Amino acid sequence: RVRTRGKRRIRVPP
């Protein structure tokens, strides 16, 4: 998954 920061990106597993 990816919290897709409101602007950046944060991958966390799938």
Added chain:
RNA sequence: GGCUCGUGUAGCUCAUUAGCUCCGAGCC
């Protein structure tokens, strides 16, 4: 905890778009 999400009524940032901590939630 195993699987999935959310930036996250979680935040910080470096830089990396990431990487630091955690959750909270849903299912079995």
